[PDB]
């Protein structure tokens, strides 16, 4: 209903998709109003009501408990040719891709805080039965006042399963070598690979690989001064064989990850 929301202009000139600024009339809460065409939907799911919805709606609902680290779906609507998703809109924000573009390689203290929060957000997803499958800096929002990161865009995600995945519609330069070579992957170890790409991206200022040959080659060159502890974590996440990669527990127990800043400290030291 355009009676329940005041709809404003397109956000980000379409870079997030068909997302418009909005305000919930009930209480002036800022929202992001995201439109998805039925004709362009890959995977469908069934709601507990038996209603057929896009998988993105199913995954968003499963993670929407109010944990700060993922975008919260507040409501959704079906239209003849589309679904409309009402998402919370934190302000002020910048996405982590733009943030790294203009700040350059991040100090390890800041990368540690950001990476730690991404890890907690992905753990939350997996605990809710959700595999995001498109972790990358473009899909992470920074709340610049609170110092809190938010994972966004579940449009490539899937229900978390323990069996093999044979489909993938995330970002190729973040996808693991077992996907490039065999078009097969398991969810957790593929997520860990994309987190290694993300961590390299943060401390070096851009992702390490652009070509399939680099992804499968097993060589990580560091173009920026990076501590030995951080290099070790990155190389571990980017092990060619999935079983050689760390678990989320091993990542968060790694020496490089200790003594993380709180979100508010992060904002005060690095963002304000």
């Amino acid at each position: 209903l355009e009676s329940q929301y005041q709809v404003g202009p397109l956000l980000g000139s379409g870079g997030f998709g068909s997302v418009y600024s909005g305000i919930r009339v009930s209480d002036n809460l800022p929202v992001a109003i995201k439109h998805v065409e039925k004709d362009r939907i890959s995977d469908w799911g069934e709601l507990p009501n038996g209603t057929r919805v896009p998988m993105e709606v199913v995954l968003l609902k499963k993670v929407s408990s109010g944990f700060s680290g993922v975008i919260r779906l507040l409501d959704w609507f079906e239209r003849p040719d589309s679904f409309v998703l009402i998402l919370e809109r934190p302000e002020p924000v910048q996405d982590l891709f733009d943030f790294i573009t203009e700040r350059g390689a991040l100090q390890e203290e800041l990368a540690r805080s950001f990476f730690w929060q991404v890890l907690e957000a992905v753990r939350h997803c997996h605990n809710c039965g959700v595999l995001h499958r498109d972790i990358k800096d473009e899909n992470i929002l920074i709340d610049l006042n609170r110092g809190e990161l938010k994972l966004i865009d579940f449009g490539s995600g899937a229900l978390l399963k323990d069996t093999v995945y044979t489909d993938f519609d995330g970002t190729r330069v973040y996808s693991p070598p077992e996907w490039i070579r065999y078009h097969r992957y398991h969810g957790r170890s593929a997520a860990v690979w994309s987190l290694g790409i993300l961590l390299y991206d943060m401390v070096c200022g851009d992702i390490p690989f652009e070509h399939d040959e680099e992804i499968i080659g097993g060589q990580v060159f560091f173009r920026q001064r990076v501590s030995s502890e951080c290099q070790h974590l990155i190389r571990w996440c980017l092990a060619l064989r999935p079983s050689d990669r760390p678990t989320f527990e091993e990542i968060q127990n790694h020496p490089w990850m200790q003594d993380v800043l709180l979100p508010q400290e992060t904002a005060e030291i690095h963002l304000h």
Partner: peptide, 8 residues
């Protein structure tokens, strides 16, 4: 060096 976004 050119840093770019990558569509899903």
């Amino acid at each position: 060096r050119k840093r770019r976004r990558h569509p899903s």
